[PDB]
Amino acid sequence: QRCGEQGSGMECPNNLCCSQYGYCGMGGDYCGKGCQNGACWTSKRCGSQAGGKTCPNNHCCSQYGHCGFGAEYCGAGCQGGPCRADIKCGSQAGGKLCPNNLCCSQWGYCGLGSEFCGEGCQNGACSTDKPCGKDAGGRVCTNNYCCSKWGSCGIGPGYCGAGCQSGGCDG
Amino acid sequence: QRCGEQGSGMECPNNLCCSQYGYCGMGGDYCGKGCQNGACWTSKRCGSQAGGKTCPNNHCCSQYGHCGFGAEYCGAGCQGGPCRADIKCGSQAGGKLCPNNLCCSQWGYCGLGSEFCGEGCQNGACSTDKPCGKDAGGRVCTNNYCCSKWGSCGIGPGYCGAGCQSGGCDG
Ligand SMILES: CC(=O)N[C@H]1[C@H](OC[C@H]2O[C@@H](O[C@H]3[C@H](O)[C@@H](O)[C@H](O)O[C@@H]3CO)[C@H](O)[C@@H](O)[C@H]2O)O[C@H](CO)[C@@H](O)[C@@H]1O
Numbered sequence: 001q002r003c004g005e006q007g008s009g010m011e012c013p014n015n016l017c018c019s020q021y022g023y024c025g026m027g028g029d030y031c032g033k034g035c036q037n038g039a040c041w042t043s044k045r046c047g048s049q050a051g052g053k054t055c056p057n058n059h060c061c062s063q064y065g066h067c068g069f070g071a072e073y074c075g076a077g078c079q080g081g082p083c084r085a086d087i088k089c090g091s092q093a094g095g096k097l098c099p100n101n102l103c104c105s106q107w108g109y110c111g112l113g114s115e116f117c118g119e120g121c122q123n124g125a126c127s128t129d130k131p132c133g134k135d136a137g138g139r140v141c142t143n144n145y146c147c148s149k150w151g152s153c154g155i156g157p158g159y160c161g162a163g164c165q166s167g168g169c170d171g
Numbered sequence: 172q173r174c175g176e177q178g179s180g181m182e183c184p185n186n187l188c189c190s191q192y193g194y195c196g197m198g199g200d201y202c203g204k205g206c207q208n209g210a211c212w213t214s215k216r217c218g219s220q221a222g223g224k225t226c227p228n229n230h231c232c233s234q235y236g237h238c239g240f241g242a243e244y245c246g247a248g249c250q251g252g253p254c255r256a257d258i259k260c261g262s263q264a265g266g267k268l269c270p271n272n273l274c275c276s277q278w279g280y281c282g283l284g285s286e287f288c289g290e291g292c293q294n295g296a297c298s299t300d301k302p303c304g305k306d307a308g309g310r311v312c313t314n315n316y317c318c319s320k321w322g323s324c325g326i327g328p329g330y331c332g333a334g335c336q337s338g339g340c341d342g
């Protein structure tokens with residue numbers, strides 16, 4: 001239920017602002033001073049102008065490095081988030097990965113749903129579930145995901161714990 | 172640190188899958204059966220198809236009522252979320268309010284950032300706190316937000332509890 005640092009990076013539903021103390025709400029108490037994520041009155045920096053950091057809550061990063069929605073943020077110059085432009089990736093783009101765990105279609109563009117994560121998916125939250133490791137001819141996961149003992153890619157102690165074949169192993 | 176139901180409608184950062192058990196991670200144990208939000212393998216339903224339902228994590232609802240990202244989703248047809256087309260609202264669109272607490276600009280389009288939430292903001296998460304209640308001519312807030320004791324609009328205990336002048340007051 002807590003959010004921000006007090007909630008492990010958690011986000012509030014419906015763009016609700018996460019107060020500096022880690023609770024979800026709307027109003028100055030949450031959206032004002034110390035706002036962690038959500039519709040912060042005080043807009044979060046991103047991309048080029050902010051060390052490459054991405055926007056939380058899947059907001060778009062304007063050409064100016066500010067987080068939000070609308071033509072201004074998602075239109076021309078958008079550096080991140082659901083940009084109105086099509087985001088290239090995969091072999092077709094220097095082997096690039098999609099941002100914020102987006103899947104890369106076989107056609108070389110970023111997205112989510114069966115058309116992007118389905119078959120041909122190059123990276124991101126692909127739902128194909130290709131095996132990795134000892135039995136996959138030594139295959140390693142994409143996105144530094146952890147290859148578990150059963151030889152599946154994922155993130156969470158069950159994938160990254162002891163017996164973590166490769167990737168972001170805790171162990 | 173719980174997501175979905177077990178964490179009060181809370182969502183994971185970076186489109187991480189909220190498991191049936193309320194924990195964030197990626198993989199089948201998270202993104203497969205039971206997934207409550209995030210980049211679930213079997214995409215969430217929305218729109219007119221699912222009773223008017225919005226998409227979690229600010230995903231787009233395609234014309235067919237499935238949640239995701241990419242041309243197919245946010246492109247033509249888009250029913251909700253950060254569509255490619257501009258979302259009209261306010262007095263221009265029949266006093267229509269923006270979805271997901273988005274701000275309705277002075278011009279009749281939804282968004283987040285100083286441009287939609289500042290001067291002229293019509294509904295949604297405006298950063299401007301127009302006073303409500305007794306000391307405001309008995310003005311009421313937009314979106315059924317709670318007019319608080321001290322005379323401010325917001326959501327959360329402080330605003331909707333004891334001294335809630337109007338709105339989504341509980342007590
Ligand atoms: C979309 C976006 O990221 N807006 C930022 C804003 O952008 C910084 C640049 O602003 C340009 O001027 C904007 C101005 O801010 C708007 O109010 C106006 O309506 O449109 C013009 C378009 O150019 C300047 O040209 C440029 O020098 C930058 O300053 O910055 C503010 C904070 O400064 C931010 O809150 C907002 O999200």
Ligand SMILES: CC(=O)N[C@H]1[C@H](OC[C@H]2O[C@@H](O[C@H]3[C@H](O)[C@@H](O)[C@H](O)O[C@@H]3CO)[C@H](O)[C@@H](O)[C@H]2O)O[C@H](CO)[C@@H](O)[C@@H]1O
Binds near residue numbers: 235238
């Ligand atoms: C954008 C969207 O909502 N996609 C839905 C899809 O929507 C109905 C249409 O499905 C098309 O089929 C998909 C196919 O399932 C994808 O895997 C493939 O890569 O692309 C096509 C085109 O989007 C039909 O061709 C079209 O006529 C519509 O009926 O429905 C599917 C379930 O059928 C859903 O999984 C997908 O997320």
